[PDB]
Amino acid sequence: GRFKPLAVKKKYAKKMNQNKPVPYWIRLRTGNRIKWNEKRRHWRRTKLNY
């Protein structure tokens, strides 16, 4: 709905910014081990409930 505390709104904002793929140049570093974000979230799979 329309209502939410500002503190709640900021928590949702941070989760929106974290929901991104890994930059491509990360895979070219020496000794890299990362391929995908592995913490991607979708609104229909898992709920944050805050």
Partner RNA sequence: CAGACCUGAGUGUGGCAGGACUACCCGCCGAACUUAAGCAUAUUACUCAGCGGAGGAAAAGAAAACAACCGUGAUUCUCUCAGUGAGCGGCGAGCGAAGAGGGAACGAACUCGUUGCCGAAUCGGGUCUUACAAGGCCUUGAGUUGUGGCAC
Partner RNA sequence: CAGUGUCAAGUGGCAGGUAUUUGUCUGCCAAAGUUAAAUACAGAGUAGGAAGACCGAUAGCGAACAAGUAGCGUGAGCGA
Partner RNA sequence: CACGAGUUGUUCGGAAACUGAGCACAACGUUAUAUCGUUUUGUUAGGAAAGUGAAGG
Partner RNA sequence: AAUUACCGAAUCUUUGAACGCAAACGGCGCAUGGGAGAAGCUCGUGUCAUCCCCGUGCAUGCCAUAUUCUCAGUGUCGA
> Is 50 within any annotated ligand binding site?
yes
Among 45, 36, 40, 44, CA closest to 15: 40
39 binds RNA (CB under 7 A): yes
DSSP codes, the chain: -----HHHHHHHHHHHHH--PPPGGGGGSTT----S-S----TTT-----
Residue of the chain from 14, 17, 21, 25 that contacts RNA (CB under 7 A): 21
From the list other proteins, RNA, none, pick the one residue 14 interacts with, judged by a Cβ distance below 5 to 8 Å according to partner type: other proteins
From the list other proteins, RNA, none, pick the one residue 42 interacts with, judged by a Cβ distance below 5 to 8 Å according to partner type: RNA
Which residues carry a binding-site annotation for Mg(2+)?
50
